[PDB]
Amino acid sequence: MVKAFWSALQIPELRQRVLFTLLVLAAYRLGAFIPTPGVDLDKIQEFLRTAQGGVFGIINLFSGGNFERFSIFALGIMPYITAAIIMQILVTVVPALEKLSKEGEEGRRIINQYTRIGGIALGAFQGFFLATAFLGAEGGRFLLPGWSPGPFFWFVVVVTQVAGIALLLWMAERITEYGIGNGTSLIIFAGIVVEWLPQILRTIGLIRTGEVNLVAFLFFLAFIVLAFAGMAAVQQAERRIPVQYARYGGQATYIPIKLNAAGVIPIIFAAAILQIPIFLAAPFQDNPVLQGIANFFNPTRPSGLFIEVLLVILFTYVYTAVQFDPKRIAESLREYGGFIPGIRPGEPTVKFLEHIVSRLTLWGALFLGLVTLLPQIIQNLTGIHSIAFSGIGLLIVVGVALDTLRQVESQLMLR
């Protein structure tokens, strides 16, 4: 079990890819300590620890804790996810981009490079937006002494931020080609899980003082494992719809309908989306109307958690459910006479598969919504509190893991 990895890793072909993947995240972690020229990180940290700057939780989570210490990638690979969602809306609505989308190998890599140029530009904006609306905002509230709200800071942050994002986005796409799994995915994943070990450590240091008891903590770690399991149970879970083929070349098979099609993307997506309101509205400190907007979507508070949970549902359902399913399948069965036993070929096959996929996919989504919602409840009754173990914290960690493990075997079959 523990060695089932060992031998399969002791083949240097992959052992090299792990030691690159780990290396790129090492240099990403290295950059996390490269502070932005004019920023008073101690003030930023203080602010984040106060109730006021509580909303910035998720922002600082998906920044990998880079926001907490304005690194060259203050927001991390998150601007790139924002570009990914923008251009994949424009691929649908704008039809000229839909032409380029379906246009084979190089056509799929051009959108990929308009998104790559989408993201890097978006870092410039976000960097400026923060430097302008937030960092030098009040008295230069978060400016080190010597620094001033002038355009010199503005420009010097914009540079630090475009330098940082470009560095990082390049680092990302290496983890895809020369590494394990998917770059971006793994970067996000790294940001969350980094803050895990010290947290786990500090929690048991404070169990001693008498502040926490081992009953509650042992309930929490039990639940994480339980959650980790349930999702593992759900990924494995399938419904097999029997097919059968005519007379040679005539025997039975099954078309598999999963509960959640590799739900890695809709989750990082939903997270990004939820941050859009926070990110725009929160950094205006003095404006009460905006602070309301931001504090609405705060995932810790029930209002935001609900907006978060409805999001994970929708994004999951629409992801899993739309995999160019029913109508082509019903027609493809024509190739060599295929049918679902007992059910008429054609329209009744479509409506059959439609119904099943609909009713199924929905349970897949709902489940993932418990995994989002429950940790908070559980966190609330327990004294333990951190955004890193906040369901969206879990679902991406568990998500990237499976995504990464699944992508090993697909090529490990090939290798």
Partner 1 sequence: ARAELARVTWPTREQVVEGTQAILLFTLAFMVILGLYDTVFRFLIG
CA distance 392 to 396: 6
The answer to whether the beta carbons of residues 278 and 129 sit under 8 Å apart is no
Binding flag, residue 197, partner 1 (CB under 8 A): yes
State the binding partner of 239 from partner 1, Zn ion, none, CB within 5 to 8 A by kind. Answer: partner 1
* β-bridge mates for residue 398, sequence order: none
Binding flag, residue 347, Zn ion (CB under 5 A): no
Kindly report the backbone phi and psi dihedral angles of residue 252, in degrees, each rounded to the nearest multiple of 5, phi listed first: -85, 150
State the binding partner of 8 from partner 1, Zn ion, none, CB within 5 to 8 A by kind. Answer: none
CA neighbours closer than 13 Å in the CB half-sphere of residue 113: 7
DSSP helix/strand/coil, 164: helix
Q: 181 or 277: whose CB is closer to partner 1?
A: 181
By beta carbon distance, the residue nearest Zn ion is 286
With a CB cutoff of 8 Å and minimum separation 6, the contacts of 38 are 135, 136, 143, 144, 147, 153, 156, 157
Binding flag, residue 235, partner 1 (CB under 8 A): yes
Binding flag, residue 409, Zn ion (CB under 5 A): no
Helix (H) or strand (E) holding 290: helix 288-297
State the binding partner of 80 from Zn ion, partner 1, none, CB within 5 to 8 A by kind. Answer: none
Binding flag, residue 358, partner 1 (CB under 8 A): yes
Binding flag, residue 409, partner 1 (CB under 8 A): no
Q: 293 or 408: whose CB is closer to partner 1?
A: 408
Q: 74 or 396: whose CB is closer to partner 1?
A: 396
Task: Supply the minimum distance, in Å, between the C-beta of residue 37 and Zn ion.
Answer: 23
Binding flag, residue 335, Zn ion (CB under 5 A): no
Candidates 22, 110, 276, 310; binder of partner 1 (CB under 8 A) is 22
Binding flag, residue 352, partner 1 (CB under 8 A): no
Task: Supply the minimum distance, in Å, between the C-beta of residue 134 and Zn ion.
Answer: 11
CA distance to 104, 266, 276, 353, per residue, from 79 (Å): 26, 16, 11, 38
Binding flag, residue 351, partner 1 (CB under 8 A): no
Handedness of CA 106, 323, 91, 124 (dihedral sign): negative
346 phi-psi bin (left φ>0, alpha ψ -120 to 50, beta other): left
Candidates 13, 105, 286, 335; binder of Zn ion (CB under 5 A) is 286
Candidates 46, 138, 211, 347; binder of Zn ion (CB under 5 A) is 138
Candidates 47, 228, 284, 296; binder of partner 1 (CB under 8 A) is 228
Structure token digits, residue 167:
């560095």
State the binding partner of 286 from Zn ion, partner 1, none, CB within 5 to 8 A by kind. Answer: Zn ion
3-state helix, strand, coil in the chain (%, to 5): 70, 5, 25
Q: Among 301, 382, 228, 314, which residue's Cα sits nearest to residue 58?
A: 301
The answer to whether the beta carbons of residues 61 and 393 sit under 8 Å apart is yes
Binding flag, residue 174, partner 1 (CB under 8 A): no
Strands 252-258 and 338-339: what pairing? unpaired
Strands 252-258 and 238-245: what pairing? antiparallel
Tell which positions 26-65 bind Zn ion, by CB under 5 A: none
Q: 50 or 236: whose CB is closer to Zn ion?
A: 50
Residue holding tokens 């029997």?
242
User: To the nearest 10°, the Cα dihedral for 324, 329, 331, 332?
Assistant: 110
Candidates 8, 10, 11, 33; binder of partner 1 (CB under 8 A) is 33
With a CB cutoff of 8 Å and minimum separation 6, the contacts of 71 are 31, 32, 33, 34, 35, 36, 164
State the binding partner of 296 from Zn ion, partner 1, none, CB within 5 to 8 A by kind. Answer: none
SS (H, E, C) 345-393: CCHHHHHHHHHHHHHHHHHHHHHHHHHHHHHHHHHHHCCCCCHHHCCHH
Binding flag, residue 301, partner 1 (CB under 8 A): no
Binding flag, residue 16, partner 1 (CB under 8 A): no
Pick the piece of the chain touching partner 1 (CB under 8 A) from 38-46, 121-129, 195-203, 321-329: 195-203
CA distance 27 to 160: 16
Q: 103 or 238: whose CB is closer to partner 1?
A: 238
Binding flag, residue 404, partner 1 (CB under 8 A): yes
Binding flag, residue 194, partner 1 (CB under 8 A): yes
Pick the piece of the chain touching Zn ion (CB under 5 A) from 90-98, 130-138, 386-394, 405-413: 130-138
Footprint of Zn ion (CB under 5 A)? 138, 285-286
Footprint of partner 1 (CB under 8 A)? 1-2, 5, 22, 25-26, 29-30, 33, 189-190, 193-194, 196-198, 225, 228-229, 231-233, 235-240, 259, 356, 358-360, 362-363, 397-398, 401-402, 404-405
